[PDB]
Amino acid sequence: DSLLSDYDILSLSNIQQHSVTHVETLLTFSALKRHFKLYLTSSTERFSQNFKVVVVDGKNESEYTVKWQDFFTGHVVGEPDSRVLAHIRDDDVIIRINTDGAEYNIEPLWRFVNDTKDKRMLVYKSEDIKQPDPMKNTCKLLVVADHRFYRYMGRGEESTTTNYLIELIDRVDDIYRNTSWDNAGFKGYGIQIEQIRILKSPQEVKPGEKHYNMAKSYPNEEKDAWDVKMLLEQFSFDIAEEASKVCLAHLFTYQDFDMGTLGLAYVGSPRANSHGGVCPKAYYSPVGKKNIYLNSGLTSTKNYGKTILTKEADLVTTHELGHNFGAEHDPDGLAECAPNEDQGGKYVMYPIAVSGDHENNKMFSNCSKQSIYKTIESKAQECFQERSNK
Template identity: 35%
Template sequence: MTFILDLVLVRDTFYFPIAIDVIVLYAYTLAIVEGAIHDKLTYHEVINIHNSHVRHKRSTNNDMSEFIKEFHFQAFNRSFTCNLTPRLNFFSPNFILAVYGENGKPVEHSFRRDQIYFGKCDGDPDSEIRGTFKEGIFSGTVHYDGELYGVENAKFHIQASSINDDSHMLVYRANDIIWQEGQKTQFSPSFCGNIHLNISKDDSHTIVDHATQAKPSRRKRSTATTLNTCKIIAVADYKFFRGVGRNNIYDTALYMANVIDRVDNIYRKTFFNLETSMDGFGFEIAKMVIYRYATNGFNAETDSWDPLNLLQAFSRNTEYKNYCAAHLFTHQSFFGNVLGLAYIAPPREGQVGGICSPLARLNDHMSSLNTAWSSTKNQNGDTVLLQQANLVTAHELGHNWGAEHDPETSDCSPSTSRSGKGKYLMYPYSVSGYDANNLLFSPCSRELMSRVLKLKRDSCFSEKSFDTNQVCGNGIIDEGEECDAGLLGRFNLDSCCNNNCQLIGDATCSPANHECCMNCTKAPSGYMCTQDSDVDCFESAFCKYPFIHSCSLHPFL
């Protein structure tokens, strides 16, 4: 057998079943910064959430938990108005959050699954915002007008007298990110290096448990193209729980979900080199495990781990064989600024490692080799930026899916000066996420990953789940719906949207979903979608044709 691993040094008008949050924030730049923020970013701005206006309308229908948020903020000399809706099909229907306490026994905890948000900004269809909210703090990314912005809790990165509570957000551009030495140039040690473990098939001490893979005859009959979802188990050790989650179960789970959502978004947009309709591959969170206290094995209380030893210790949990992939989130420094480690899936029959891998005996231990880990702490002891955590995790899981590092060829490692689009995600040295290629897999990566998917998707990939709460008539445009007029639509009382959540006749929109929709079509420029109100402290808003999401509210100055 050959083991391969990698070392990585709304405001819309809805009916009953919704709630609306409107958040308005303004940015300023701290005059005095006492922390190490300038070692991470060449420039940044800070948002104080106390300079905000929040409007919250809760549905009288207590059975529905959906929220629609309109998020306003000003930074980098521009104003953003973003409409976000919760993502309800990101967690498996039988999702479990298991928390290990001081007695070392797991206890299931409840976790709201509607806290991952996505949407558009200023009505621009090419924009994208993804992230989470916690007590007014937004953590996520905003892609707008060719720029990628990161937004997150400033307290993680700034130790200043004026940052003494959870009331500030850090805003930065991807091209402002500074990677630590050992990560940023081709002439420095890579934060990512390959290690190959060659174990003979004839080794009498090596056992492969082929029985752990699902039998096709026992699966629900599905076409190959619908098996596009890798169910992942995300594990947080006690160091991550304390360092990033700050001893809070909800914050720990929310951070992991935020990162995996961003990774899933990258993968779902990738077209793999298979037969037709081979895009839409991604992840679904089946289970989260959080350790509040040190235990043993990979979660033992120790000052430092060797990167390989940590991966091997983490892989000794044979439960992971029940999932497509298992990922450990930790918060500790490694020599050489190592940020992660992953087994690479070989694109050949009869070998183990990476996604869907069966159990195998390694160093006298039965091990799950569909594993990887990533750390949120660099060699200086600082917490990495959320955008860096996104990229590292996406890179590591790319290895689990079979991608090697991009070779130095013009196709897979194009010259930035010539292409203007930068290196791809699997480049051996760090990418910032600023250049267009940074969030894409190269042709070389897609070819290798495609070969692995051909071999393994039938054994452990699943159909994408659909939340049972995503029903026509909830006032939210869910997957497969063209519109959703809420209660009126259920009784065919909306002239634009029928009770099957499909547009009627020549209709292109419904006012039930879009304020810049008039007579079932996009409203013309200048159409007043909201009148000024002294109660809400917002000026009148006007539509900007042809964007139906362009009813942007602005506070009175």
């Protein structure tokens, strides 16, 4: 459990005093070696008018009312150049602070110590982990969380699962909106959740059948995880109906993939004849007598048997989404596409997953930014909607 260097322990109820448009916040806590006086805001309109969260079941469904009073976003006092996201509840707290390059993150402890009833924060710095037309600038992405993710990273409760999913997606969107794909004003072509699908229970299947939510694994039940390619293909097959009207459909799951991989999505392409990527291009398959849309994705949040930190999960999610956005794995031959550790470390889209080695580990390489620009320039006119929020 104790792998990274700085993992100082915090208690929410004692140290986070939480002193007080719409509702403001001036919460503070003595975490690490900083007084951490914050300023945060939330409102109703930050959530989409079509932002429907469905917690599916076996033939049953329900809608969860997202608490717009909770998800905060603001700045640290005295540092107007900072950007901090947060989500404060009675016990659930997921905060992420960006200032002076170094990044400070918060997680509940129950995800790591294998005891879900513990309440505590995990404050750490990501730098010390041991290892141009607007109005079409938003890709409505569909979030799918299968039963493993809900059971292991949500305590069996829907609220924690959706809160974590929204926080991670907001992190990814904040990463995306900053980057300029052409080294010019063409920036802000990020993502936005359209509908979160939370699978609370495994889907019973007939013997010999397949499902991306079943309680087993396709290649062999001896392992505790699917094959990455087969799992992604099956997820694309099963979600084909719900993925038609959404720009992307990303699956969040919890199993230990083989050989250290964590996620893999279909690579995008600006070509009309190519299926798979940003736009929901049609592709028929006689196996299921239905159209198959290859605008899928995959993100597992468990490697080597231990739940990974939110920073590495965010990095894997944006790596998969960059694969979806037409990018390709960085070529290890050139230091300009991917440098060595000393000169800023590996960029995003690296063949292997790197969590927090250096600062530009969250930044897309131009060597991989060109492909994303090529795909976006041709797919934005087709399957990019409005921002609809702030």
